[PDB]
Design an enzyme around this catalytic site. Structure first.
Site, PDB file in Angstrom:
ATOM      1  N   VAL A   1      53.057 -56.066  90.699  1.00 38.08           N
ATOM      2  CA  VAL A   1      52.267 -54.906  90.286  1.00 38.08           C
ATOM      3  C   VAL A   1      51.830 -55.164  88.846  1.00 38.08           C
ATOM      4  O   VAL A   1      52.553 -54.857  87.893  1.00 38.08           O
ATOM      5  CB  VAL A   1      53.042 -53.589  90.405  1.00 38.08           C
ATOM      6  CG1 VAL A   1      52.149 -52.417  90.065  1.00 38.08           C
ATOM      7  CG2 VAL A   1      53.606 -53.428  91.803  1.00 38.08           C
ATOM      8  N   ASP A   2      50.638 -55.732  88.680  1.00 38.48           N
ATOM      9  CA  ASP A   2      50.073 -55.925  87.357  1.00 38.48           C
ATOM     10  C   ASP A   2      49.655 -54.577  86.769  1.00 38.48           C
ATOM     11  O   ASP A   2      49.536 -53.587  87.496  1.00 38.48           O
ATOM     12  CB  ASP A   2      48.900 -56.906  87.425  1.00 38.48           C
ATOM     13  CG  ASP A   2      47.788 -56.440  88.340  1.00 38.48           C
ATOM     14  OD1 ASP A   2      47.941 -55.387  88.982  1.00 38.48           O
ATOM     15  OD2 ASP A   2      46.752 -57.131  88.418  1.00 38.48           O
ATOM     16  N   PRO A   3      49.456 -54.502  85.447  1.00 41.21           N
ATOM     17  CA  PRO A   3      49.245 -53.187  84.814  1.00 41.21           C
ATOM     18  C   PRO A   3      48.089 -52.383  85.385  1.00 41.21           C
ATOM     19  O   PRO A   3      48.171 -51.147  85.424  1.00 41.21           O
ATOM     20  CB  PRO A   3      49.002 -53.550  83.343  1.00 41.21           C
ATOM     21  CG  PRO A   3      49.743 -54.816  83.155  1.00 41.21           C
ATOM     22  CD  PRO A   3      49.599 -55.570  84.440  1.00 41.21           C
TER      23      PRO A   3
ATOM     24  N   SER B   1      46.889 -52.462  88.618  1.00 38.97           N
ATOM     25  CA  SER B   1      47.394 -51.876  89.852  1.00 38.97           C
ATOM     26  C   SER B   1      48.499 -50.871  89.568  1.00 38.97           C
ATOM     27  O   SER B   1      48.689 -49.930  90.342  1.00 38.97           O
ATOM     28  CB  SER B   1      47.888 -52.961  90.804  1.00 38.97           C
ATOM     29  OG  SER B   1      49.098 -53.532  90.346  1.00 38.97           O
TER      30      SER B   1
END
Ligand SMILES: CCCCCCCCCCCCCCCCCC(=O)OC[C@H](COP(=O)([O-])OCC(O)COP(=O)([O-])OC[C@@H](COC(=O)CCCCCCCCCCCCCCCCC)OC(=O)CCCCCCCCCCCCCCCCC)OC(=O)CCCCCCCCCCCCCCCCC
Ligand SMILES: CCCCCCCCCCCCCCCCCC(=O)OC[C@H](COP(=O)([O-])OCC(O)COP(=O)([O-])OC[C@@H](COC(=O)CCCCCCCCCCCCCCCCC)OC(=O)CCCCCCCCCCCCCCCCC)OC(=O)CCCCCCCCCCCCCCCCC
Ligand SMILES: CCCCCCCCCCCCCCCCCC(=O)OC[C@H](COP(=O)([O-])OCC[N+](C)(C)C)OC(=O)CCCCCCCCCCCCCCCCC
Ligand SMILES: CCCCCCCCCCCCCCCCCC(=O)OC[C@H](COP(=O)([O-])OCC[N+](C)(C)C)OC(=O)CCCCCCCCCCCCCCCCC
Ligand SMILES: CCCCCCCCCCCCCCCCCC(=O)OC[C@H](COP(=O)(O)OCCN)OC(=O)CCCCCCCCCCCCCCCCC
Ligand SMILES: Nc1ncnc2c1ncn2[C@@H]1O[C@H](COP(=O)(O)OP(=O)(O)O)[C@@H](O)[C@H]1O
Lengths: 50, 228, 39, 125, 118, 587, 6, 98, 68, 26, 167, 115
Positions: free
Chosen positions: H53-55, H57
């Protein structure tokens, strides 16, 4: 008429705000309150004239 | 937990709401059309059956496949794009001018009142809603290869059909960003049927080309080398 | 001679005009009868 | 988040900063913080205008959010001193200004909401 | 299988399901309508429609102003069939002249009576 | 009984209502929630029944009463004033409407605020406001009128700022407080001028001897101002502030955070009507005034246009209703400028009843939406609030003035008597026409967006209101008492409006005397209209028809039904043409 | 509102 | 009825919503995302980077989380969330959570 | 090698494919056909019209004789 | 459902006066 | 998204999947002779009326065959005019719930008879038309379990959950 | 004699006060026809619904005819309806006849109504 600036959100929010009458009237009332009441009445009257 | 109480609402009590609420059928009432036509022998007689079986539609007008090959507009040409339903609706709307306008001219007590009301109605809402989109609408698109042009069939006033030829080299794609601003009213109330991401134009004349979203495209015609 | 007096004068003039119109219509119908009776 | 946008004598610059970023002073935020906060504000505004709107079109909303996501993914990987990143910031601050509503719906859970502090709660004293 | 009855029913139930709920709580629709509220609303709506219909039937001047004057359904006494022949024809002529003279008298008296009550 | 006709019981029942309200306020610990509710319900029901009995006698027959309670105060050397009440047609017209709307709002207010900690306070505040307004409209002299004027301002300051723990609502209440102080100053100066001229405060006497002072002037420091002009100026100024005309309207939209029963009472009759009452109370003075003749139609038409157009753009339900109220107050001002005093009463009754009902429906919707009043977060509420949907449909079609409804007739009557002799007539007429067509827009927007749009609200509302365990005969998203209140309010409104229409608009004139000697020819165009007038009204009819077509058939979004929508529009046009031909020419 | 002690 | 005696406030468990219900709903919403690979590896102790979960997303998911839980979360609160447990506790301890 | 009628269709197809399903997955309950309908389908006019007919027949046989 | 605790005292947060109150803003 | 037309052919060995028990005949005369078929045909008159007047594009299916080489379904449709033969590409078929079929039409539908299958309605995206079957029917278990009809090859989340949305 | 009732009696001022005729009717010329109608309604009480729904006015049908005649004449003379309608239809013929040159000189039909 293929283009209409009255369907854009600028005109819509202008009309929804009541033609900005409340905002304009309140700004002048703030100027009256601040200037007259605070400055003139308390500072001018009490500090200088009294 | 309605089943745990002797006095409680049931589906028999809720049956009256089936006029406003959609549910699968449960039983046939005596006054339904199905029951009436099943019980009355006047409909079982041969006269009524013959009248129904040969009226109100025809089977030869119903599409029998997911592929359609319309008749060629010219020999040596091949088919590219056709419209299905918006074209019919637009042609009927234009055909309204062939009967309502003379009818108003001959039967209205004050014909000038009708025109005086129709001027602002056209200029403020109806021109953007239907008429201009119909003018720029593409009813049919075919390609003439010996001439290296496209033939576009369009709808005119009174429901008139007319076909025009445009050079292939003069065709160019119009990104939506170039038209969304000076035609915002048309794209706001009168452009939801055509594809706004597939607008083309003829740079030689400036005429636009809109295509129906639920239209049909020929796979062989779309991959022809002339169209690349 | 100011204030509402102009409105009162306008109302009086309008009433006089309406009475004159009614009288003219009555005279017209009388003239039509006396003209048709001659023939 | 405290919704005191209009009940304090704020200028437009302060209100614009508070709308785009969760602070009046965005200069004390990191690059990633600024990018994420601007993305959240933009998505919130687009949802408030294209899902909870007047005549909402879901297809158009999906197209716009996809484009915004692509643009912000480009924004994140840029460098803070680049002029292209500054242009992107300016563009999305202009987007926030252009969709500004004097009649914003304020969630009832926010500190300065319309129905906040309607009851005085007595403590154990 | 696409035509399997079990999977088809599962998809029918699951097309608009809520995917953040439990297995048996995914439904997101109201399966009924409030009985009392619907009944009272239907009664008040029927009252409003009846009022609209009374306005249409009893005071049609809006239709006269907006769309004009329509044709009227036939309505005649057919009471003059009692007499026959030359008597009938003569009485038709007398009644026709009486109607025309009545309209003329109405117009003329309307134009004359301006001086009365002054 | 002749005893009832000779000695009114309205005074007894109104005193019972007032004393029960005051004693409930003081002795609130003895009476719980139920005790206060029951006691005040009994008192208000008795008052309503007595006033309903006397309504027919005062309206149709020529019955009115002058009651004196006793000598009250010394206001000059050797001069004393008494507490006088005048129960006549003008007073009863406002008081009956206020009492009926108040009875139904009172019954609705228990279902509203169902589990709030301060239901008793709200009930008693509503009772106090209603009592103050009824006392104001039943004034016999100018001192009682001033007392009622100051009481309605004070009690409305407490219905507003009901959430006294918030300074945000304190600001909104203080705005109205300041405007009411200005109103009180203007009214009290006008009363001082009247008393300095005639040396009396009795209203009836004032209405019969003011014509003797038409040719009088007063000496301001460098000006000689006509007496009627200055008195009318001050009265019109205070009326404009109370009735929220253009400019002095800004306090009214900010008054919307009060609970919705308070809004239903304040915006439908009562406060907003108070100024109108003043114009009806002192008709000869404004008949003899040049300032009124110029200022009533212009300001009324501007206010009507402004409120109508601003209302059609609102997204908050209460803001939409408030701006509709502003527009209708402007329309009432124009209707008074017409010079026909019956049309004013008809407009007042119709607007008040239907606006109050619409407030009640909107309040139930807002309670369901968990205090979110913007319909941008609503949609598909028909299945959860069906009674609200149907009753709201009826109330909006009547309120918006749609054709073939009761609200159509007041607009038509307004346009019958409009005077064309004004210098600024083009602006006035354009404003009136633009404000008349605005009702359809906001009515359609409110109804469609609340009930028959896509689901724009939060998932919690819909999903928590639809659990399987809740399926029962007792299931409801509102209260039964609210539904009964709205139903009976609509029924009583229809009955009263039909009775008034029969009394005023029949060939046989049956209304009692209005105590006015200024008579114009406005009824002629109602009794014997001519061709050009009918064509002129048909023009506006067709404008409204075009606007209805626009709001029904315009597609602002992509949908699967777009092509079929265009096809249906074409079918409707062709069918209408053919139907007209068949109905007019052949069979 | 949820009840709280007084 | 109140007992007519001095009764203090009751804090009970300190959760205004069921922590298990909040955690299950939040994990289902997380698993609804495109860039989340498998729902079976998500745990209360899992870090947003572990589950992919990148920032961006992350903000996308946390907007739908506040839509689903009928609340709204401040930027600082979201910035202070390191694992699923932190967000679950913050949501379950919110008075407005439905 | 031009760019007519197929290049831009392919670009539009790619743009459509590049959308994230996540948002769709969180808004499917909003379009439930089991829980929403149009206004004319909810405001049925059959039984009110029956009541209208009954009331107008009663008026016609009570006061309708005295018209004009 | 769930046994909710009492209404939190955070419903009325305490103000801290980070700035001086000017006599020109009285 | 774009209705590109694929030219198809007909296989020589169709596989029967669906059989209607009350419409085994092959013509209007045969249907008229049969009493049950005549009763069903009369019960279907409101169906045809909704098809014609209300512009509701549904169709009523009697027979269904599968052509696996071309992946084409052959449908025998019953209208008031007679019996039609139609070919449907397998890529253009999706399942729809009963409420989608009802709500597709703005006009209120007549009360439906109890013999039409209310759980197996299939939408054609290219033709934008509905397909309905009979409750009293014979479904070929081996025919419908063909490998090319498995949802593993035909499932598509977008085309099945978001392609048709009734606003 | 459209302003005269069945028996040609002029009511006194005291009679007008006693029968409480409204000021609106008093300002017009139809008092002598209005008073008998009000009296008949007084000894024949009727509900408002019946008053609305009865074209003949029930038991008051005899006086209501005189009142209708008086009211029609009064309102048409009050607003010049007869002259205005005569000029609306065939304005050229009315101008040639000189029905009313005061109204005829300033009369102008709208453009939407057949020019
Ligand atoms: C006798 C007693 C009569 C009692 C009548 C009671 C009311 C009956 C109607 C019930 C439904 C009312 C819905 C109101 C809300 C609304 O319009 O939502 C938009 C809503 C949008 O939803 P949608 O279905 O997705 O729309 C997309 C397409 O447009 C969908 O297109 P479509 O194919 O579905 O529609 C085609 C067709 C479908 O046919 C039907 O639905 C038939 C059933 C209704 C027939 C109604 C009479 C039609 C002829 C007149 O409808 C028409 O062709 C309508 C044309 C006529 C209306 C416009 C011009 C009117 C000029 C004269 C007005 C005079 C009366 C004024 C008002 C009087 C007091 C109420 O549109 C509709 O509901 C349209 C259908 C209803 C049209 C008639 C409405 C009559 C009421 C007056 C107009 C509305 C004014 C604003 C009211 C706002 C609330 C207070
Ligand atoms: C042949 C030509 C047929 C043409 C049919 C209409 C066009 C269809 C295609 C386009 C679609 C469309 O826009 O449809 C409009 C409209 C769409 O409404 P919907 O809500 O979609 O309803 C769908 C279904 O019909 C399901 O609706 P439902 O089962 O609930 O049936 C209720 C329906 C039909 O039921 C009723 O109307 C019941 C009436 C009960 C009271 C009757 C007495 C009333 C007092 C007068 C007594 C004298 O009523 C309504 O839908 C009410 C809305 C407005 C329509 C009726 C307006 C009446 C006058 C209003 C103004 C005054 O379709 C209909 O209203 C159904 C029309 C059915 C056939 C109509 C012709 C026969 C009517 C019987 C009396 C006359 C007999 C003449 C015999 C032959 C003489 C030569
Ligand atoms: C000199 C030019 C002559 C041609 C004019 C061409 C433009 C107008 C063409 C006609 C359009 C409308 C056709 C259908 C009319 C149906 C109603 C009817 O017949 O009314 C009688 C009347 C005619 O009756 P009339 O002329 O005998 O007198 C009626 C009384 N007046 C004129 C004073 C109101 O029709 C009209 O008034 C129509 C003109 C106004 C509307 C013009 C179109 C606006 C856009 C379309 C709106 C929807 C129309 C259909 C639905 C209307 C009802 C809801
Ligand atoms: C539910 C009931 C109906 C609600 C809608 C009624 C709409 C029409 C209201 C008419 C009000 C004016 C009136 O009384 O006009 C006199 C007329 C009677 O005609 P009239 O001859 O006494 O007066 C008409 C006068 N001119 C011609 C100048 C306009 O009353 C009606 O038409 C009554 C209609 C409704 C009757 C309801 C009975 C209950
Ligand atoms: C202060 C200004 C004083 C001006 C002079 C006295 C008032 C006017 C005296 C002459 C009579 C007159 O014209 O009265 C009518 C006037 C209202 O009409 P007006 O607004 O002028 O109409 C516009 C015309 N196109 O009437 C008025 O303007 C009367 C205004 C009375 C109240 C003035 C303000 C309060 C007292 C100070
Ligand atoms: N006494 C004051 N004088 C001038 N401005 C003030 C005063 N108090 C508050 N403000 C203005 O109102 C705002 C109040 O913000 P504040 O409640 O302090 O936010 P936070 O609690 O997050 O610091 C400040 O930004 C300041 O500009």
């Amino acid at each position: 008429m293929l283009k209409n600036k009255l369907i854009k959100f600028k005109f819509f929010r202008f009309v929804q705000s009541g033609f900005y009458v409340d905002f304009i009237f309140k700004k002048f009332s703030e100027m009256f309150i601040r200037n007259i009441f605070i400055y003139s009445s308390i500072f001018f009257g009490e500090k200088f004239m009294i | 937990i309605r089943h745990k109480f002797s006095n409680e609402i049931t589906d028999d009590d809720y049956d009256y709401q089936r006029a406003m609420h959609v549910k699968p059928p449960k039983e046939e009432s005596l006054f339904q059309l199905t029951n009436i036509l099943s019980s009355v022998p006047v409909f079982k007689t041969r006269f009524f059956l013959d009248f129904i079986a040969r009226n109100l539609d025809t089977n030869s007008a119903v599409s029998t496949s997911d592929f359609v090959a319309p008749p060629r507009v010219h020999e040596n040409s091949f088919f590219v794009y056709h419209s299905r339903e918006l074209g019919n609706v637009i042609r009927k709307y234009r055909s309204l001018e062939s009967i309502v306008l003379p009818g108003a001219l001959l039967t209205f007590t004050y014909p000038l009142f009708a025109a005086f009301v129709a001027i602002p109605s056209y200029y403020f809402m109806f021109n953007a809603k239907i008429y201009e989109m119909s003018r720029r609408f593409v009813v049919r698109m075919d390609v003439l290869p010996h001439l290296e042009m496209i033939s576009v069939q369009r709808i005119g006033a009174f429901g008139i059909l007319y076909t025009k030829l445009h050079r292939i080299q003069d065709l160019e794609y119009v990104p939506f960003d170039q038209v969304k601003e000076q035609e915002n009213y048309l794209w706001a109330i009168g452009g939801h049927g055509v594809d706004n991401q597939l607008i083309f134009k003829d740079r030689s004349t400036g005429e636009f080309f809109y295509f129906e979203r639920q239209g049909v495209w020929d796979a062989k015609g779309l991959n022809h080398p002339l169209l690349n | 001679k100011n204030g509402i007096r102009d409105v009162i004068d306008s109302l009086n003039a309008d009433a006089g005009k309406r009475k004159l119109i009614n009288l003219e219509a009555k005279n017209f119908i009388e003239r039509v009868e006396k003209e048709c009776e001659q023939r | 988040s405290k919704a005191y946008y209009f009940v304090k004598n704020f200028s437009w610059a302060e209100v614009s900063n508070l709308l785009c970023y969760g602070t009046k002073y965005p200069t004390v935020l990191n690059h990633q913080q600024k990018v994420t906060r601007l993305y959240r504000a933009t998505l919130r505004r687009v949802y408030a205008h294209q899902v909870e709107g007047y005549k909402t079109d879901f297809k158009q909303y999906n197209e716009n959010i996809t484009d915004i996501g692509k643009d912000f993914n480009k924004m994140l990987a840029l460098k803070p001193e680049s002029l292209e990143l500054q242009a992107y910031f300016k563009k999305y601050e202009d987007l926030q200004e252009e969709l500004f509503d004097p009649a914003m719906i304020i969630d009832e859970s926010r500190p300065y909401a319309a129905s906040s502090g309607r009851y005085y709660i007595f403590d154990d004293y | 299988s696409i035509f399997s009855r079990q999977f088809k029913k599962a998809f029918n139930d699951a097309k608009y399901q809520n995917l953040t709920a439990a297995q048996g709580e995914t439904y997101s629709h109201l399966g009924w309508i409030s009985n009392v509220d619907l009944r009272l609303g239907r009664a008040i709506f029927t009252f409003g429609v009846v009022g609209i219909a009374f306005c249409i039937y009893l005071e049609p001047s809006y239709f006269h102003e907006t769309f004009g004057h329509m044709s009227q359904p036939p309505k005649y006494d057919l009471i003059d069939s009692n007499i026959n022949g030359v008597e009938k024809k003569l009485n038709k002529q007398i009644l026709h002249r009486e109607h025309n003279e009545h309209k003329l008298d109405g117009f003329v008296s309307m134009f004359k009576g301006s001086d009365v009550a002054k | 009984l002749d005893f009832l006709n000779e000695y009114p019981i309205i005074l007894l029942t109104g005193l019972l209502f007032l004393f029960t309200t005051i004693f409930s306020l003081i002795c609130l610990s003895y009476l719980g929630l139920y005790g206060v509710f029951i006691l005040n319900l009994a008192s208000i029901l008795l008052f309503w029944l007595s006033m309903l009995y006397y309504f027919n006698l005062i309206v149709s027959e020529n019955y009115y009463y002058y009651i004196s309670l006793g000598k009250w105060m010394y206001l000059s050397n050797g001069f004393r004033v008494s507490f006088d009440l005048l129960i006549d047609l003008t007073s009863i017209s406002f008081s009956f409407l206020t009492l009926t709307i108040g009875v139904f709002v009172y019954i609705y207010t228990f279902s509203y605020f169902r589990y709030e900690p301060l239901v008793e306070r709200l009930i008693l505040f509503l009772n106090s406001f209603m009592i103050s307004m009824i006392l104001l409209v039943s004034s016999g002299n100018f001192i009682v009128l001033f007392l009622g004027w100051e009481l309605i301002g004070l009690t409305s300051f407490f219905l507003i700022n009901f959430w006294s723990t918030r300074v945000g609502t304190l600001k909104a209440a203080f705005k109205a407080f300041s405007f009411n102080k200005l109103s009180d100053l203007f009214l009290f100066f006008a009363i001082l001028i009247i008393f300095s001229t005639t040396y009396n405060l009795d209203i009836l006497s004032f209405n019969n001897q003011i014509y003797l002072y038409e040719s009088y002037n007063i000496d301001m420091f460098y000006w000689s101002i006509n007496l009627i002009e200055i008195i009318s100026f001050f009265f019109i100024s205070c009326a404009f502030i109370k009735s929220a005309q253009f400019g002095a309207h800004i306090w009214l939209p900010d008054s919307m955070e009060a609970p919705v029963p308070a809004s239903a009472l304040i915006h439908s009759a009562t406060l907003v009507s108070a100024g109108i009452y003043l114009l009806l109370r002192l008709s000869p003075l404004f008949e003899l005034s040049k300032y009124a003749y110029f200022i009533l139609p212009l300001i009324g038409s501007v206010t009507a246009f402004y409120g109508g157009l601003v209302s059609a753009f609102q997204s908050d339900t209460k803001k939409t209703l408030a701006y509709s109220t502003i527009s209708h107050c402007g329309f009432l001002m124009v209707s008074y400028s017409t010079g026909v005093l019956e049309f004013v009463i008809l407009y007042l009754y119709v607007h008040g009843f239907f606006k109050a009902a619409t407030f009640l429906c909107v309040g139930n919707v807002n309670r369901f939406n968990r205090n979110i009043q913007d319909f941008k977060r609503m949609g598909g509420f028909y299945k959860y609030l069906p009674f609200e949907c149907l009753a709201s449909f009826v109330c909006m079609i009547n309120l918006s003035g749609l054709p073939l409804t009761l609200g159509f007739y007041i607009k038509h009557l307004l346009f019958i008597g409009l005077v064309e002799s004004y210098t600024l007539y083009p602006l006035i007429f354009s404003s009136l026409i633009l404000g008349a067509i605005a009702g359809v827009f906001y009515s359609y927007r409110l109804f469609y967006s609340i009930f028959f749009d896509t689901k724009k609200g939060k998932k919690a509302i819909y999903l928590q209101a639809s659990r399987i365990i809740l399926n029962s005969k007792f299931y409801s998203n509102t209260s039964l008492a609210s539904n009964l209140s709205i139903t009976f309010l609509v029924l009583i409104s229809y009955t009263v409006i039909l009775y008034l229409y029969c009394t005023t608009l029949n060939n046989y004139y049956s209304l009692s005397d209005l105590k006015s000697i200024y008579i114009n020819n406005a009824y002629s165009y109602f009794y014997k209209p001519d061709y050009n007038f009918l064509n002129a009204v048909s023009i506006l009819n067709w404008f409204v028809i075009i606007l209805l077509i626009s709001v029904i058939y315009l597609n602002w979004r992509w949908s699967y039904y777009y092509t079929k929508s265009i096809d249906s529009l074409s079918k409707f046009i062709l069918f209408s043409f053919f139907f007209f031909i068949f109905s007019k020419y052949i069979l | 509102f949820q009840k709280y002690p007084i | 009825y109140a007992p007519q005696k001095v009764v203090l406030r009751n804090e009970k468990s300190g959760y205004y919503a069921n922590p298990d219900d909040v955690a299950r709903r939040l994990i289902r919403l997380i698993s609804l995302h495109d860039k989340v690979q498998n729902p079976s590896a998500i745990t209360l102790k899992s870090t947003w980077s572990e589950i992919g979960v990148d920032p961006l997303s992350y903000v996308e998911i946390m907007l739908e989380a506040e839509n689903e839980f009928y609340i709204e979360l401040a930027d600082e609160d979201l910035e202070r969330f390191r694992t699923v447990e932190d967000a679950v506790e913050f949501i379950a301890r919110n008075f407005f959570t439905n | 090698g031009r760019k007519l009628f197929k290049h831009y269709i392919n670009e539009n197809i790619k743009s459509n494919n590049e959308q994230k399903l996540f948002f769709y997955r969180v808004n499917r309950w909003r379009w439930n056909t089991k829980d929403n309908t149009t206004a004319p389908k909810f405001l049925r006019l059959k039984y009110p019209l029956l009541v209208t007919g009954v009331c107008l027949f009663a008026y016609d046989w009570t006061y309708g004789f005295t018209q004009v | 459902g769930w046994d909710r605790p009492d209404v939190p005292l955070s419903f009325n947060p305490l103000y801290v006066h980070k700035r001086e109150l000017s006599i020109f803003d009285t | 998204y774009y209705n590109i037309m694929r030219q198809v052919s007909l296989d020589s060995n169709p596989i029967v999947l669906y059989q209607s028990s009350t419409f085994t005949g092959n013509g209007l005369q045969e249907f008229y002779e049969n009493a049950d078929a005549l009763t069903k045909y009369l019960k279907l008159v409101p169906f045809f009326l909704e098809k014609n007047l209300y512009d509701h594009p549904k169709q009523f299916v009697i027979k269904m065959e599968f052509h696996p080489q071309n992946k084409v379904l052959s449908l025998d449709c019953l209208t008031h005019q007679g019996v039609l033969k139609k070919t449907v590409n397998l890529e253009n078929l999706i399942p729809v719930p009963y409420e989608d079929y009802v709500q597709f039409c703005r006009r209120k539908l007549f009360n439906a008879p109890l013999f039409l299958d209310t759980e197996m309605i299939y939408f054609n995206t290219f033709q934008n038309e509905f397909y309905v079957f009979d409750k009293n029917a014979k479904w070929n278990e081996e025919g419908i379990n063909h490998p090319e009809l498995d949802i593993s090859k035909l499932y598509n989340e977008k085309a099945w959950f978001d392609s048709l949305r009734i606003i | 004699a459209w302003n005269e009732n069945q028996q040609h009696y002029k009511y006194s001022k005291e009679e007008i006060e006693a029968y409480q005729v409204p000021m609106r009717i008093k300002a017009g010329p139809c008092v002598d026809t209005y008073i008998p109608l009000k009296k008949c309604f007084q000894e024949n009480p009727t509900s408002f619904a019946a008053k609305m729904l009865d074209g003949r006015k029930g038991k008051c049908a005899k006086e209501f005819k005189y009142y209708n005649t008086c009211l029609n004449h009064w309102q048409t003379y009050e607003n010049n309806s007869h002259v205005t309608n005569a000029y609306w239809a065939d304005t050229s013929k009315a101008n040639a006849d000189g029905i009313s040159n005061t109204y005829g000189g300033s009369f102008r039909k709208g453009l939407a109504w057949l020019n």
